[PDB]
Amino acid sequence: DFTLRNARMDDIDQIIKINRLTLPENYPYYFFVEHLKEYGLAFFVAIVDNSVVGYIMPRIEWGFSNIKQLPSLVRKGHVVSIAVLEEYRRKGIATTLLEASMKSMKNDYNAEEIYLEVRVSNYPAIALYEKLNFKKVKVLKGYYADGEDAYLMARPL
Ligand SMILES: CC(C)(COP(=O)(O)OP(=O)(O)OC[C@H]1O[C@@H](n2cnc3c(N)ncnc32)[C@H](O)[C@@H]1OP(=O)(O)O)[C@@H](O)C(=O)NCCC(=O)NCCS
Numbered sequence: 001d002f003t004l005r006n007a008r009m010d011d012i013d014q015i016i017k018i019n020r021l022t023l024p025e026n027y028p029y030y031f032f033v034e035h036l037k038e039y040g041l042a043f044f045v046a047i048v049d050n051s052v053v054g055y056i057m058p059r060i061e062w063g064f065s066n067i068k069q070l071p072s073l074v075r076k077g078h079v080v081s082i083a084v085l086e087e088y089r090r091k092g093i094a095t096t097l098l099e100a101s102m103k104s105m106k107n108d109y110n111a112e113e114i115y116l117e118v119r120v121s122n123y124p125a126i127a128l129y130e131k132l133n134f135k136k137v138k139v140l141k142g143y144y145a146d147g148e149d150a151y152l153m154a155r156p157l
Contacts, residue, residue, distance in 0.1 A: 002093055004100055007036055007043040007055060014052035015045065022083040024144070035059060035080060042077065042104035046084065046093045054084035056097040060109045066137055067113055067154050077105030077157070079116035082125075094128050106157040115154035117143055129153045 007015070012032050020026055036043050039058045046054035059078040064071055079101065084093045105111035117140060118125045134153040143150035 002046045002048050002053065002088065002091065004044050004046055004096055006040060007045045007057075009033070009036065011045050011052050011055070012036070015055045015057075018052065018055060018083050018085060019081065022085070023081065025081065027081070032057065039109070041108040042101045044097050044100045046088070046097060048088060053088045054082075054093045054097060056082040056094075056101045058101050058105065060105065060111065065113060066115055066152060067156065074112045075110050077102070077109060077111035077114040079114065082116075089124075094125075095132065098128075098132060102157060111157050113154055113156050115152060117150040117152055119144060120149045120151060126151065126153075 012029065015032060016029065035057050039060050042058040042060070044056050045052045057080045059080050061076040061078055063073060063076065065074045065076070068074075079098070082094060082097060102114055105114055115137070116129070116134075118129065132155070134155045136151045137154045138152035140150040140152055142148075
């Protein structure tokens with residue numbers, strides 16, 4: 001079994017470890033710290049027996065909607081990074097991390113939409129998001145450093 005709670009400064013070391021092991025976008029320590037201090041209410045970790053096994057790091061924005069056809073200014077929640085240690089996958093951790101972050105984006109930060117970028121090859125992640133009713137709304141060409149395309153996936157809150 002796992003539990004969720006908001007991330008704390010003392011979680012950052014384990015979060016970075018997870019990020020280093022599971023993702024190619026290896027942000028520096030100060031990046032994690034600033035997102036925790038600025039958007040901490042929507043920054044969650046998953047815990048198994050006192051260890052962090054997953055996390056979701058958000059960014060809160062104000063700007064043009066990426067869902068609406070017309071230029072329209074909205075509050076947006078942006079998933080910067082989400083990862084779960086391999087041993088603890090297929091347990092619903094990412095699903096519950098996203099739900100918790102979404103609820104805070106909506107209630108704490110008045111977000112009207114949530115969105116993220118995902119590698120077009122990232123089959124597990126895409127399945128996750130489509131199950132949570134994210135839609136592929138844009139294709140960011142050459143979004144990743146190696147040139148790989150991203151789907152911009154989004155949904156209203
Ligand atoms: C994507 C990731 C975060 C999902 O974590 P997770 O805790 O295993 O996800 P969940 O258990 O909540 O998944 C829920 C649903 O998503 C889908 N899904 C998740 N992983 C899948 C896979 N490998 N293949 C097919 N569907 C998958 C399934 O529908 C799953 O439902 P189910 O378990 O009942 O079959 C995880 O695989 C991961 O950390 N990958 C490496 C880092 C990464 O790519 N992060 C996302 C970048 S945008």
